[PDB]
Amino acid sequence: ENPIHDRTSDYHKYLKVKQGDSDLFKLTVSDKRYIWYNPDPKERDSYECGEIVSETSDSFTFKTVDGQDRQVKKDDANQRNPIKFDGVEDMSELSYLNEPAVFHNLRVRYNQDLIYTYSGLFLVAVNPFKRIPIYTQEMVDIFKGRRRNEVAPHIFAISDVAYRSMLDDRQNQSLLITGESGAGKTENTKKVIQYLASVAGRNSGVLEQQILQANPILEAFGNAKTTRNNNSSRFGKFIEIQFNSAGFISGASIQSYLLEKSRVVFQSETERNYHIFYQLLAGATAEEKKALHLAGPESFNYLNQSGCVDIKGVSDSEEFKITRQAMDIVGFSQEEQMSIFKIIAGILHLGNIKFEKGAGEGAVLKDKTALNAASTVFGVNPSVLEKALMEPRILAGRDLVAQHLNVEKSSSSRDALVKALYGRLFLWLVKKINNVLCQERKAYFIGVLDISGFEIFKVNSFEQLCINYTNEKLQQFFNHHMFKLEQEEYLKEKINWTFIDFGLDSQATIDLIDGRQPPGILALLDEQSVFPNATDNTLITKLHSHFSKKNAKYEEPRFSKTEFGVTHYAGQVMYEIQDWLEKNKDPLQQDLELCFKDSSDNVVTKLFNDPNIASRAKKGANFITVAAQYKEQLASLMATLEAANPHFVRCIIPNNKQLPAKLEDKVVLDQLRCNGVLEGIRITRKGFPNRIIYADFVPRDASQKATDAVLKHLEQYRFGITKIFFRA
Ligand SMILES: [Mg+2]
């Protein structure tokens, strides 16, 4: 408690509000009252401060920056909290709770690099887009074991609360970090793992280092630069840190989700492919480059299409050293790593294969430099691969028929092979890692969820619907645990609570997407995926007839025939239907699988012969679809979190330019609205947060009134059947 109460410490310098000056005290003592108003009535999110000069029984009259006088009815007034509240660590304490006031406090805090603020029971994290030194080992030690009230808001603080609640209650916990693309999820995820790895680690603790080095691996193959984030996680993950009864870390398990493997073969302008492609070409030795027939990223069709090969302030050559070091710590062998880079080098070669029209409408390959280079590194027969690309054999009834695919379909099958290769390598990486950390049968666990977030682009596809649908369910889980389950408890225990509707329900949008009866978008997509004469247009035509003018969350646009709109909690998203059928089916010519099953490389062969990696579950006579499969594993995850005690962290992006020291009014407030932040504060103030059973609620044995005496010795708090609740 030396540095907590020492103004000289880095703690107070970087985690506490700076001491106000002589002049600020004179304003903190003022009797004047102020108000938040909109100078431009229809610019609803930009406010200014004004002094209240007079009031009637129902109205305030205040002054504008210009000097004019404006009038507002008290029922519609956003009063400004006294400035003594400016910078408060928990905004439950604010007297007036309105949008401009909540944003104001955060602003006051953001201006001094105070990115963490509590909103009742959950935490708010505003991305600084700059490195601030509050994640050192010294800071870890300060927060170790401290109550939430005793120290300042911090990701370590709520991580510690989950750890203590795990041991006190003997139950599993979850740390759910929400936010849109670029808001701060993965960065805060890393800190949660850091803190838990330290306060619960063993002081020969190599397991703990191994857990820390597992994420740098997945980021190199799993993250990429998008228009909204230079280190965008193109996959979701549930990280399950495991402990023993004693409370020390016993193991860990990663469950990956929804890899955007369509990115390996296509990227929008200014976007990049997965980091690892640029780390190899930039950090590979001359020996390696010569062995894998490599060149610069400008020479590969999968990397020379968006116009961008760099990320500002990132050395791909240097990042390559980090992932190789991380693979050493986790225990990948030298030949494993070399086989991994063969697959990456081979994928890039496959991308430069150009099919051209032959004598007939079928395709031909006049230049086989890329084909041979790929076959070389993979260890497969090139002419077998060649026939498997352009001439795959299928069954027609029972006859064995050989196709002759045109240029278009030959390139698509080549892309299918690439995406299959990369997607299976990723599951392999996660699988090898999970096995190195599968060393003890857990007693409890603290689950950390780090998903891809809400994202909108000029062109949104099946991948964006799955991402945004996942973010819609997480927001509903926040709504569920904060408002419905909360009041249901109050109602059940009969403490005379009048139900409140907070107006936060994403169920209509969720049913529209994943509903079975009536069928939703994914159900109709699955239905068309197996219908043999279905097209991308017969699909959206089907979606319009089912939901246009029928479901209030669905819009058939008048300006386009291949797009449809879904109204999410974070906003309407228009989705392009192109390629949805083939993306849901995820086809791959089996002749291509056969060719790689005969591969020289040990890794490649396990990617195509290991049943857990290479098989696909069958739904009758058809393979299970991407939609149906992801739905199953999403339901399993949400079942895991409903059984665990949730701790929420709401990440907020300050602007859409990835810049520091720039907190934009209307970008922040929209996230505060759709996240339900203020609703989450009101329920904690109006409501009663915790309840302990009567028996455990000073003669220490007994009658529900036994516990009444203690408070007497020490309306405000109420009694219910079987439990006792507290307020504030
Ligand atoms: Mg991320």
XYZ file of C-alpha atoms and ligand atoms in Angstrom:
729
model
C 0.000 0.000 0.000
C 3.058 2.206 -0.344
C 2.511 2.854 -4.095
C -1.299 2.969 -3.927
C -1.073 5.992 -1.605
C 2.203 7.441 -2.962
C 1.548 10.167 -5.531
C 5.128 9.678 -6.762
C 4.501 6.086 -7.859
C 3.870 5.052 -11.445
C 0.557 3.705 -10.135
C -0.848 7.136 -9.295
C 0.911 8.750 -12.259
C -0.672 6.395 -14.800
C -3.830 4.987 -13.165
C -5.236 7.840 -11.042
C -6.771 11.240 -11.721
C -4.234 14.009 -11.396
C -4.557 16.422 -8.505
C -6.609 19.466 -9.396
C -5.094 22.897 -8.914
C -6.018 25.908 -6.793
C -8.225 27.283 -9.571
C -10.146 24.028 -10.047
C -11.179 23.955 -6.382
C -12.920 27.316 -6.769
C -15.051 25.836 -9.558
C -15.665 22.574 -7.685
C -17.175 24.662 -4.868
C -19.497 26.686 -7.108
C -23.253 26.756 -6.556
C -23.894 27.127 -10.296
C -25.587 24.301 -12.202
C -25.006 23.365 -15.837
C -26.691 21.339 -18.555
C -25.776 19.333 -21.651
C -27.553 20.572 -24.788
C -27.270 20.166 -28.553
C -26.260 23.387 -30.369
C -27.381 21.707 -33.604
C -30.697 20.024 -32.682
C -30.324 17.296 -35.327
C -26.617 16.664 -34.607
C -27.750 14.605 -31.646
C -24.358 13.356 -30.418
C -22.431 16.666 -30.237
C -23.045 18.590 -27.005
C -21.870 21.737 -25.259
C -22.002 22.989 -21.676
C -24.469 25.655 -20.603
C -25.331 27.387 -17.351
C -28.818 27.019 -15.893
C -29.985 30.558 -15.128
C -33.638 30.033 -14.133
C -36.167 27.255 -13.682
C -39.931 26.876 -13.570
C -41.895 24.030 -11.989
C -41.282 21.982 -15.155
C -38.527 23.733 -17.127
C -34.903 24.834 -17.042
C -33.680 27.978 -18.807
C -29.977 27.970 -19.676
C -27.449 29.994 -21.655
C -25.732 28.961 -24.880
C -22.082 29.395 -25.816
C -23.256 32.233 -28.065
C -25.298 34.009 -25.374
C -28.822 33.179 -26.526
C -31.250 31.663 -24.016
C -32.896 28.292 -24.641
C -35.608 26.399 -22.783
C -35.964 22.681 -22.057
C -38.531 20.752 -20.037
C -37.043 19.103 -16.965
C -38.182 15.656 -18.136
C -35.962 16.046 -21.235
C -32.949 17.744 -19.609
C -29.466 16.205 -19.540
C -28.152 17.869 -16.398
C -24.380 18.049 -16.013
C -22.966 16.299 -12.959
C -20.994 18.490 -10.528
C -17.387 18.584 -11.685
C -16.278 16.817 -8.503
C -17.593 13.735 -10.333
C -15.377 14.359 -13.380
C -12.999 11.410 -13.530
C -14.928 9.158 -11.150
C -13.772 5.551 -11.373
C -17.277 4.033 -11.098
C -20.045 5.866 -12.953
C -22.668 4.199 -10.779
C -21.795 7.066 -8.416
C -22.896 9.803 -10.832
C -25.911 11.827 -9.724
C -27.254 12.365 -13.257
C -26.985 9.383 -15.620
C -27.471 10.516 -19.221
C -25.601 9.976 -22.474
C -23.634 13.278 -22.515
C -22.674 12.812 -18.854
C -21.435 9.238 -19.299
C -19.456 10.265 -22.376
C -18.109 13.270 -20.502
C -16.631 11.280 -17.656
C -14.988 8.873 -20.104
C -13.593 11.853 -22.004
C -12.153 13.395 -18.865
C -10.531 10.093 -18.175
C -9.458 9.497 -21.764
C -7.665 12.831 -21.934
C -5.267 11.650 -19.171
C -4.845 8.156 -20.676
C -7.250 6.678 -18.109
C -8.709 4.099 -20.463
C -10.464 1.900 -17.869
C -13.700 2.953 -16.164
C -16.261 0.891 -14.274
C -19.976 1.017 -15.117
C -21.401 -0.747 -12.085
C -20.425 -4.406 -12.222
C -18.703 -4.366 -15.640
C -15.660 -2.587 -17.055
C -15.308 -0.170 -19.972
C -12.074 0.004 -21.985
C -11.517 2.822 -24.495
C -8.760 1.936 -26.957
C -5.877 4.427 -26.540
C -4.073 3.466 -29.783
C -0.834 4.197 -27.921
C 1.370 2.263 -25.508
C 0.757 3.322 -21.821
C 2.879 1.690 -19.061
C 0.268 0.079 -16.820
C 0.931 -3.563 -17.734
C 4.363 -4.075 -16.154
C 5.200 -6.819 -13.671
C 5.259 -4.150 -10.959
C 1.646 -3.281 -11.784
C 0.643 -6.956 -11.669
C 1.996 -7.204 -8.124
C 0.064 -4.156 -6.903
C -3.306 -5.487 -8.064
C -2.572 -8.975 -6.694
C -5.338 -9.857 -4.245
C -6.787 -6.350 -3.974
C -10.518 -5.678 -3.783
C -12.167 -3.784 -6.621
C -12.856 -0.743 -4.433
C -9.299 -0.534 -3.099
C -7.506 -0.013 -6.437
C -8.234 1.821 -9.681
C -10.051 0.379 -12.710
C -7.825 -2.021 -14.646
C -8.075 -5.217 -16.669
C -5.947 -6.877 -13.986
C -8.504 -5.837 -11.361
C -11.472 -7.647 -12.902
C -9.202 -10.571 -13.792
C -8.322 -10.808 -10.095
C -11.991 -10.597 -9.099
C -12.752 -13.572 -11.343
C -9.830 -15.472 -9.811
C -10.949 -14.786 -6.236
C -14.577 -15.610 -7.055
C -13.376 -18.903 -8.543
C -11.711 -19.907 -5.269
C -14.324 -18.472 -2.892
C -17.374 -19.870 -4.705
C -15.641 -22.963 -6.161
C -17.138 -22.331 -9.600
C -15.894 -21.671 -13.116
C -15.687 -18.084 -14.339
C -15.693 -16.354 -17.717
C -14.277 -13.022 -18.898
C -16.329 -11.898 -21.913
C -14.701 -9.028 -23.807
C -17.053 -7.385 -26.297
C -16.325 -4.731 -28.899
C -16.319 -3.997 -32.602
C -13.335 -4.487 -34.865
C -10.452 -2.357 -33.522
C -12.024 -1.673 -30.077
C -9.449 -3.482 -27.878
C -10.451 -7.168 -27.366
C -7.298 -9.112 -28.233
C -4.999 -6.653 -26.451
C -7.029 -6.970 -23.246
C -7.268 -10.734 -23.759
C -3.465 -10.897 -23.662
C -3.426 -8.974 -20.377
C -5.948 -11.334 -18.771
C -3.698 -14.276 -19.640
C -0.619 -12.396 -18.414
C -2.194 -11.581 -15.053
C -3.617 -15.053 -14.427
C -0.350 -16.650 -15.558
C 1.508 -14.575 -12.947
C -0.694 -14.523 -9.845
C -1.580 -18.219 -10.259
C 1.695 -19.444 -11.756
C 4.256 -21.641 -10.030
C 7.618 -20.120 -9.106
C 10.237 -24.209 -13.062
C 7.040 -22.659 -14.409
C 7.503 -23.453 -18.084
C 3.823 -24.340 -18.509
C 3.096 -20.723 -17.804
C 5.497 -19.494 -20.464
C 4.068 -22.004 -22.901
C 0.599 -20.651 -22.416
C 1.882 -17.145 -23.020
C 3.622 -18.176 -26.232
C 0.642 -20.027 -27.702
C -1.177 -16.858 -28.801
C 1.748 -15.327 -30.740
C 1.612 -18.489 -32.863
C -2.091 -18.243 -33.691
C -1.865 -14.508 -34.408
C 0.700 -15.001 -37.181
C -1.600 -17.410 -39.038
C -4.890 -16.130 -37.621
C -4.653 -12.340 -37.784
C -4.410 -9.977 -40.741
C -4.725 -6.346 -41.528
C -8.185 -5.083 -42.501
C -9.458 -1.566 -43.143
C -10.566 -1.403 -39.485
C -7.615 -3.030 -37.683
C -3.994 -3.707 -38.607
C -3.987 -6.824 -36.379
C -7.533 -8.037 -36.973
C -8.287 -11.466 -35.515
C -9.830 -13.360 -38.440
C -10.836 -16.158 -36.046
C -12.562 -16.421 -32.704
C -11.122 -18.269 -29.739
C -12.285 -19.377 -26.300
C -9.207 -19.597 -24.062
C -9.820 -21.822 -21.032
C -7.177 -21.295 -18.353
C -7.364 -24.236 -15.951
C -6.554 -24.450 -12.247
C -6.298 -27.139 -9.584
C -8.157 -27.253 -6.279
C -5.192 -25.496 -4.660
C -5.671 -22.624 -7.123
C -2.507 -22.906 -9.233
C -2.601 -23.102 -13.020
C -2.916 -26.740 -14.087
C -3.331 -26.418 -17.851
C -5.104 -24.628 -20.673
C -7.225 -25.258 -23.757
C -7.943 -23.156 -26.853
C -11.115 -23.554 -28.934
C -10.831 -21.736 -32.257
C -13.771 -20.539 -34.330
C -14.569 -19.369 -37.830
C -11.262 -18.842 -39.588
C -11.737 -16.456 -42.528
C -9.889 -18.749 -44.915
C -11.395 -16.997 -47.940
C -8.766 -14.340 -47.153
C -5.875 -16.597 -48.198
C -6.960 -16.206 -51.837
C -8.565 -12.743 -51.814
C -8.213 -9.453 -49.947
C -10.010 -6.147 -50.418
C -7.976 -3.120 -51.444
C -5.370 -1.917 -48.930
C -5.989 -5.063 -46.880
C -3.459 -7.765 -46.380
C -3.257 -11.540 -46.263
C -2.409 -13.340 -43.032
C 0.748 -12.053 -41.374
C 2.680 -15.304 -41.738
C 2.883 -14.979 -45.523
C 4.793 -11.700 -45.161
C 6.877 -12.849 -42.182
C 8.321 -15.785 -44.133
C 9.136 -13.857 -47.310
C 10.746 -11.120 -45.183
C 12.546 -13.098 -42.475
C 13.466 -16.329 -44.235
C 17.147 -17.130 -44.658
C 18.692 -17.188 -48.122
C 18.953 -20.953 -47.635
C 15.210 -21.198 -46.995
C 14.162 -18.858 -49.812
C 16.187 -20.931 -52.280
C 14.764 -24.205 -50.954
C 11.147 -23.001 -51.205
C 11.515 -21.159 -54.546
C 10.487 -17.919 -52.870
C 10.488 -14.296 -54.009
C 9.150 -11.000 -52.710
C 5.452 -10.573 -51.915
C 5.096 -8.628 -55.175
C 5.666 -11.865 -57.119
C 2.734 -13.831 -55.643
C -0.838 -13.386 -56.844
C -2.140 -13.993 -53.314
C -0.098 -11.027 -52.014
C 0.227 -8.572 -54.946
C -3.459 -7.758 -55.483
C -4.543 -5.264 -52.796
C -1.646 -2.849 -53.291
C -0.365 -3.087 -49.710
C 2.380 -5.338 -48.342
C 3.347 -3.382 -45.206
C 1.777 -2.337 -41.911
C 2.889 1.001 -40.485
C 5.340 0.399 -37.662
C 5.570 -3.367 -38.197
C 8.684 -5.310 -39.211
C 7.503 -8.593 -40.718
C 11.137 -9.725 -40.682
C 11.232 -9.076 -36.930
C 7.781 -10.503 -36.177
C 8.946 -13.682 -37.932
C 11.591 -14.180 -35.240
C 8.918 -13.971 -32.535
C 6.658 -16.695 -33.934
C 9.607 -19.017 -34.592
C 10.660 -18.453 -30.979
C 7.085 -19.094 -29.835
C 7.038 -22.350 -31.807
C 10.260 -23.367 -30.045
C 8.826 -22.716 -26.574
C 5.669 -24.686 -27.355
C 7.777 -27.512 -28.783
C 7.337 -27.703 -32.518
C 10.245 -29.599 -34.025
C 12.502 -28.126 -36.600
C 11.060 -30.297 -39.287
C 7.544 -29.494 -38.140
C 8.247 -25.793 -38.594
C 9.934 -26.426 -41.946
C 6.943 -28.494 -43.071
C 4.666 -25.659 -41.938
C 6.553 -23.161 -44.104
C 6.512 -25.613 -47.007
C 2.711 -25.486 -46.802
C 2.790 -21.680 -46.740
C 5.302 -21.453 -49.584
C 3.296 -24.070 -51.470
C 0.049 -22.155 -50.998
C 1.605 -19.053 -52.555
C 2.885 -21.082 -55.512
C -0.565 -22.605 -56.020
C -1.808 -19.018 -56.275
C 0.335 -18.258 -59.328
C -0.955 -21.234 -61.325
C -2.723 -19.680 -64.319
C -5.247 -21.793 -66.218
C -6.048 -20.748 -69.784
C -8.593 -21.885 -72.348
C -7.417 -24.880 -74.357
C -8.536 -26.075 -77.763
C -11.898 -26.948 -76.224
C -13.830 -25.065 -73.577
C -11.880 -27.031 -70.971
C -8.873 -25.489 -69.274
C -5.166 -26.141 -69.822
C -1.919 -25.129 -68.100
C 0.658 -23.891 -70.607
C 3.180 -22.833 -67.932
C 3.868 -25.296 -65.110
C 6.553 -23.439 -63.156
C 4.204 -22.682 -60.254
C 2.630 -26.149 -60.435
C 6.009 -27.868 -60.133
C 7.273 -25.496 -57.431
C 4.141 -26.185 -55.381
C 4.327 -29.936 -55.989
C 8.001 -29.844 -54.994
C 7.514 -28.239 -51.578
C 4.323 -30.179 -50.827
C 5.812 -33.463 -52.026
C 3.102 -34.543 -54.469
C 3.142 -35.728 -58.070
C 2.703 -32.608 -60.249
C 0.888 -34.244 -63.172
C -1.441 -35.959 -60.699
C -2.177 -32.581 -59.114
C -2.554 -31.176 -62.631
C -5.240 -33.695 -63.586
C -6.902 -33.315 -60.177
C -7.210 -29.562 -60.767
C -8.503 -29.483 -64.332
C -9.922 -32.913 -64.782
C -11.373 -34.209 -61.540
C -13.157 -37.519 -61.521
C -16.681 -37.646 -60.022
C -19.456 -40.229 -60.038
C -22.472 -40.028 -62.371
C -24.719 -42.537 -60.676
C -22.034 -45.196 -60.301
C -20.002 -44.549 -63.469
C -16.588 -42.933 -63.013
C -16.578 -39.772 -65.140
C -13.677 -37.364 -65.649
C -14.478 -33.663 -65.848
C -12.722 -31.009 -67.940
C -13.226 -27.785 -65.996
C -12.979 -24.417 -67.719
C -10.579 -21.685 -66.618
C -13.066 -20.309 -64.088
C -13.798 -23.635 -62.395
C -10.160 -24.750 -62.460
C -9.164 -21.588 -60.589
C -11.999 -22.081 -58.095
C -10.931 -25.662 -57.372
C -7.348 -24.454 -56.949
C -8.647 -21.949 -54.395
C -10.617 -24.715 -52.675
C -7.388 -26.696 -52.288
C -5.607 -23.630 -50.896
C -8.327 -22.844 -48.355
C -8.568 -26.509 -47.357
C -4.799 -26.656 -46.856
C -4.658 -23.466 -44.784
C -7.778 -24.201 -42.743
C -6.488 -27.654 -41.830
C -3.021 -26.358 -40.940
C -4.692 -23.918 -38.542
C -6.665 -26.641 -36.768
C -3.429 -28.646 -36.633
C -1.573 -25.760 -34.980
C -4.330 -25.270 -32.394
C -4.397 -29.035 -31.885
C -0.659 -29.460 -31.341
C -0.768 -26.520 -28.919
C -3.740 -27.839 -26.942
C -1.907 -31.155 -26.528
C 1.148 -29.434 -25.036
C -1.052 -27.706 -22.514
C -3.304 -30.736 -21.819
C -1.291 -31.815 -18.839
C -3.685 -31.946 -15.917
C -7.326 -32.766 -15.246
C -8.810 -29.385 -14.302
C -10.532 -28.488 -11.047
C -11.846 -25.094 -12.176
C -11.235 -22.783 -15.128
C -11.495 -19.126 -16.115
C -12.618 -18.823 -19.729
C -11.529 -15.870 -21.861
C -13.537 -15.252 -25.037
C -11.832 -13.305 -27.857
C -14.030 -13.215 -30.953
C -13.827 -11.304 -34.222
C -16.105 -8.332 -33.782
C -18.767 -6.428 -35.433
C -17.521 -5.244 -38.758
C -18.994 -3.553 -41.810
C -17.397 -3.172 -45.240
C -18.481 -1.893 -48.638
C -18.982 -5.581 -49.512
C -20.193 -7.915 -46.750
C -20.368 -11.661 -47.361
C -21.237 -14.901 -45.570
C -18.188 -14.449 -43.333
C -19.426 -11.082 -42.056
C -22.895 -12.451 -41.292
C -21.388 -15.229 -39.171
C -19.160 -12.712 -37.382
C -21.947 -10.198 -36.749
C -24.420 -12.929 -35.766
C -21.915 -14.105 -33.150
C -21.535 -10.558 -31.821
C -25.337 -10.297 -31.750
C -25.550 -13.360 -29.495
C -22.860 -12.069 -27.131
C -24.725 -8.770 -26.752
C -27.880 -10.772 -26.013
C -25.989 -12.717 -23.365
C -25.078 -9.427 -21.752
C -28.729 -8.372 -21.932
C -29.795 -11.759 -20.557
C -27.571 -11.790 -17.473
C -27.864 -8.083 -16.648
C -31.603 -7.424 -16.972
C -33.720 -10.553 -17.441
C -32.031 -13.053 -15.118
C -31.477 -10.171 -12.685
C -35.126 -9.150 -12.350
C -36.316 -12.737 -12.584
C -34.425 -13.348 -9.420
C -36.018 -10.388 -7.769
C -39.440 -11.452 -8.868
C -38.909 -15.027 -7.811
C -37.758 -14.089 -4.351
C -40.569 -11.639 -3.828
C -38.874 -8.494 -2.716
C -41.603 -6.249 -4.228
C -39.754 -5.347 -7.377
C -41.622 -3.714 -10.254
C -40.282 -5.150 -13.508
C -38.495 -2.700 -15.804
C -38.112 -2.981 -19.576
C -34.681 -1.715 -20.634
C -35.528 -2.072 -24.325
C -32.532 -4.298 -25.111
C -33.588 -7.474 -26.929
C -31.678 -8.848 -29.924
C -33.893 -11.947 -30.083
C -35.798 -10.833 -33.187
C -32.552 -10.399 -35.123
C -31.159 -13.687 -33.798
C -34.281 -15.639 -34.765
C -34.180 -14.109 -38.249
C -30.711 -15.601 -38.756
C -30.646 -18.882 -36.981
C -34.287 -19.767 -36.506
C -35.482 -23.258 -37.457
C -39.269 -23.064 -37.125
C -40.054 -20.701 -38.833
C -36.818 -21.133 -40.798
C -34.241 -18.360 -40.675
C -31.582 -17.220 -43.107
C -29.175 -20.037 -42.251
C -31.963 -22.627 -42.434
C -33.015 -21.433 -45.888
C -29.369 -21.291 -46.988
C -28.856 -24.899 -45.882
C -32.083 -25.828 -47.684
C -30.769 -24.323 -50.926
C -27.243 -25.682 -50.421
C -28.559 -29.215 -51.018
C -31.259 -28.384 -53.593
C -29.513 -29.584 -56.769
C -30.650 -26.777 -59.111
C -30.212 -23.929 -56.617
C -28.347 -20.739 -57.507
C -27.191 -17.687 -55.584
C -30.209 -15.839 -57.005
C -32.727 -18.587 -56.224
C -31.359 -18.308 -52.675
C -31.827 -14.573 -52.154
C -35.119 -14.723 -54.057
C -36.077 -17.225 -51.399
C -34.856 -14.963 -48.621
C -36.876 -12.015 -49.939
C -40.113 -13.997 -50.232
C -39.653 -15.246 -46.664
C -38.657 -12.008 -44.911
C -39.232 -8.978 -47.167
C -42.170 -6.972 -45.775
C -42.560 -9.730 -43.145
C -39.700 -9.560 -40.611
C -39.047 -6.059 -39.273
C -35.302 -6.786 -38.987
C -34.975 -7.665 -42.696
C -34.977 -5.344 -45.704
C -35.099 -6.179 -49.400
C -33.232 -3.215 -50.933
C -34.752 -1.355 -53.860
C -31.279 -0.368 -55.117
C -29.824 -3.862 -55.613
C -30.937 -7.389 -56.461
C -28.049 -9.365 -54.910
C -27.979 -7.677 -51.478
C -30.176 -7.939 -48.388
C -30.059 -6.005 -45.126
C -30.116 -7.242 -41.525
C -30.668 -4.815 -38.639
C -28.129 -5.681 -35.944
C -27.772 -4.133 -32.501
C -24.752 -2.240 -33.876
C -26.487 -1.205 -37.108
C -27.911 -2.394 -40.415
C -25.561 -4.476 -42.571
C -26.110 -5.130 -46.278
C -24.856 -8.568 -47.337
C -23.921 -9.636 -50.869
C -25.257 -13.112 -51.660
C -22.595 -14.006 -54.235
C -20.884 -17.364 -53.619
C -22.912 -18.216 -50.507
C -23.938 -21.680 -51.719
C -20.368 -22.769 -52.466
C -19.169 -21.160 -49.230
C -21.757 -23.063 -47.185
C -21.008 -26.370 -48.919
C -17.224 -25.835 -48.818
C -16.551 -28.288 -51.668
C -13.223 -29.892 -52.501
C -12.649 -32.327 -55.356
C -11.755 -35.660 -53.789
C -9.248 -36.283 -56.493
C -7.346 -33.382 -54.918
C -7.572 -34.998 -51.476
C -6.270 -38.293 -52.867
C -3.260 -36.528 -54.393
C -2.209 -34.948 -51.088
C -2.826 -38.149 -49.122
C 0.176 -39.513 -51.074
C 2.387 -36.589 -50.033
C 6.013 -36.976 -48.999
C 5.618 -34.532 -46.113
C 4.631 -35.953 -42.731
C 2.606 -32.860 -41.808
C 0.726 -32.636 -45.112
C -0.294 -36.295 -44.910
C -1.757 -35.842 -41.424
C -3.751 -32.885 -42.755
C -5.484 -35.200 -45.257
C -5.440 -38.601 -43.494
C -6.021 -37.709 -39.831
C -9.799 -38.215 -39.459
C -10.216 -35.476 -36.838
C -8.430 -32.974 -39.098
C -9.540 -34.127 -42.547
C -12.951 -35.774 -42.152
C -16.299 -33.997 -42.255
C -19.420 -35.104 -40.392
C -22.207 -36.270 -42.704
C -25.872 -35.223 -42.495
C -27.597 -38.134 -44.200
C -26.345 -38.215 -47.786
C -24.732 -34.753 -47.608
C -21.798 -33.251 -45.743
C -22.680 -31.009 -42.816
C -22.678 -27.382 -43.921
C -20.542 -24.545 -42.583
C -23.638 -22.855 -41.151
C -24.947 -25.976 -39.412
C -21.498 -26.892 -38.092
C -20.695 -23.446 -36.695
C -24.168 -23.252 -35.164
C -23.494 -26.467 -33.242
C -20.173 -25.308 -31.795
C -21.541 -21.834 -31.060
C -24.397 -23.388 -29.076
C -21.899 -25.536 -27.169
C -19.856 -22.450 -26.276
C -22.823 -20.404 -25.055
C -23.882 -23.434 -23.014
C -20.439 -23.348 -21.390
C -20.747 -19.654 -20.533
C -24.285 -19.888 -19.147
C -22.870 -22.422 -16.669
C -19.991 -20.098 -15.688
C -20.047 -16.805 -13.809
C -19.586 -13.996 -16.370
C -17.380 -10.924 -16.052
C -17.929 -8.393 -18.833
C -15.435 -5.989 -20.408
C -16.895 -3.544 -22.948
C -14.178 -2.354 -25.328
C -14.839 0.960 -27.087
C -13.071 2.289 -30.192
C -12.579 6.084 -29.973
C -12.640 6.696 -33.741
C -12.494 5.005 -37.142
C -8.942 6.153 -37.959
C -6.829 4.120 -35.486
C -5.430 7.339 -34.038
C -4.571 8.241 -30.429
C -5.734 11.264 -28.454
C -8.839 11.619 -30.656
C -12.124 10.732 -28.930
C -14.949 11.333 -31.403
C -18.372 12.193 -30.016
C -20.722 10.159 -32.199
C -18.511 7.099 -32.705
C -18.321 6.486 -28.948
C -21.951 7.219 -28.090
C -23.339 4.748 -30.638
C -21.345 1.933 -29.037
C -22.504 3.061 -25.589
C -26.099 2.894 -26.834
C -26.025 -0.473 -28.606
C -23.875 -2.011 -25.859
C -26.469 -1.051 -23.239
C -23.912 0.639 -20.992
C -26.249 3.152 -19.345
C -28.943 0.487 -19.029
C -26.284 -1.626 -17.319
C -25.591 1.180 -14.858
C -29.233 1.932 -14.039
C -29.993 -1.694 -13.161
C -27.142 -1.754 -10.638
C -28.218 1.459 -8.949
C -31.958 0.891 -8.915
C -31.585 -2.764 -8.274
C -29.972 -4.797 -5.630
C -26.706 -6.502 -6.814
C -26.027 -9.480 -4.443
C -27.995 -11.823 -2.189
C -26.778 -14.323 0.430
C -28.887 -17.166 1.807
C -30.485 -16.675 5.231
C -28.641 -19.428 7.019
C -25.278 -17.905 6.090
C -26.617 -14.323 6.007
C -23.502 -12.495 17.475
C -25.341 -15.796 18.013
C -24.291 -17.629 14.834
C -27.019 -20.290 14.784
C -30.813 -20.282 14.685
C -35.788 -17.732 11.471
C -35.043 -15.152 8.787
C -34.864 -12.392 11.418
C -31.688 -13.799 12.998
C -29.645 -11.766 10.534
C -31.754 -8.661 11.092
C -29.921 -7.903 14.338
C -26.485 -7.436 12.765
C -27.521 -4.561 10.493
C -29.308 -2.968 13.451
C -25.999 -2.905 15.333
C -24.290 -1.389 12.278
C -36.193 0.484 2.458
C -32.469 0.934 1.941
C -32.061 -2.894 1.708
C -34.852 -5.516 1.460
C -35.803 -9.073 2.548
C -37.026 -11.797 0.230
C -38.210 -15.411 0.675
C -34.976 -17.422 1.378
C -32.407 -14.635 0.603
C -31.332 -11.107 1.632
C -30.284 -8.445 -0.933
C -28.050 -5.355 -0.702
C -28.074 -2.095 -2.678
C -25.382 0.362 -3.775
Mg -8.752 -9.341 -32.016
